[PDB]
Ligand SMILES: O=C1Cc2cc(Nc3cc(Cl)ncc3Cl)ccc2N1
Ligand SMILES: O=C1Cc2cc(Nc3cc(Cl)ncc3Cl)ccc2N1
């Protein structure tokens with residue numbers, strides 16, 4: 670018999686993104702080639718099958734630095750990290766291939782699905 | 792020119808609640824009288840003006856245990872902690888007074904608003 | 914607020 | 918997915 674506040678989840682994600690922008694309570698650095706991205710492990714896990722697996726590992730759960738596969742493009746990762754914290758995906762003709770490849774590696778099934786759809790249309 | 796995934800924020804919150812239920816990456820214990828509640832500091836901050844203030848404090852940000860005011864009712868806190876992680880509020884005749892008082896203390900303005908509305912109706 |  |  671609960672009541673529900675429709676905007677609650679969006680407001681929570683908006684505040685988590687504000688914490689990220691201000692580097693508050695970030696607990697991991699994701700290294701992608703020469704580029705570094707600070708984030709919250711819980712948000713990464715909630716969005717990505719790969720980070721979910723990494724941070725549930727009894728040894729990796731305690732690492733403050735995670736290095737991605739050298740094939741991963743820093744821009745594709747940046748676009749996906751922004752999507753994790755906002756629900757908004759900056760999908761463009763010039764980045765769609767790198768975004769799909771990065772989403773497949775990160776195991777972000779809904780992003781992979783829209784990339785496959787957008788590629789099929791063109 | 793971003794696209795948006797409508798269910799993303801709700802799915803993120805659902806996964807954060809799954810992490811809470813399994814006690815994964817929880818980093819704080821909230822003590823309410825004899826009762827203890829494990830949670831993620833970032834989620835508490837995203838939902839509550841009080842936890843936002845506590846965990847942005849340069850000394851309190853590093854505490855693993857937070858003791859609430861002894862007037863705070865453990866059931867009212869439990870109902871609010873569930874709301875933080877689900878958007879669902881178990882508001883009942885028998886708990887509404889304790890829920891409003893706890894939401895006022897935690898600085899959860901939308902919960903305070905619905906409690907004031909529900910009390911006014913009766 | 915809604916009835917979910 | 919939508920146009921926000
Ligand atoms: O496309 C995706 C997105 C995703 C997110 C998560 N994260 C969780 C899943 C569960 Cl069941 N509980 C907790 C978490 Cl944090 C796992 C796999 C995938 N695949
Ligand atoms: O009723 C409420 C709910 C709430 C949440 C937060 N948390 C934040 C606010 C900002 Cl601007 N950035 C980041 C965070 Cl985590 C503060 C005050 C209140 N009052």
Ligand SMILES: [Cl-]
Pocket residue numbers: 716777778779780781
């Ligand atoms: Cl996704």
Ligand SMILES: [Cl-]
Pocket residue numbers: 838899900901902903
């Ligand atoms: Cl609220």
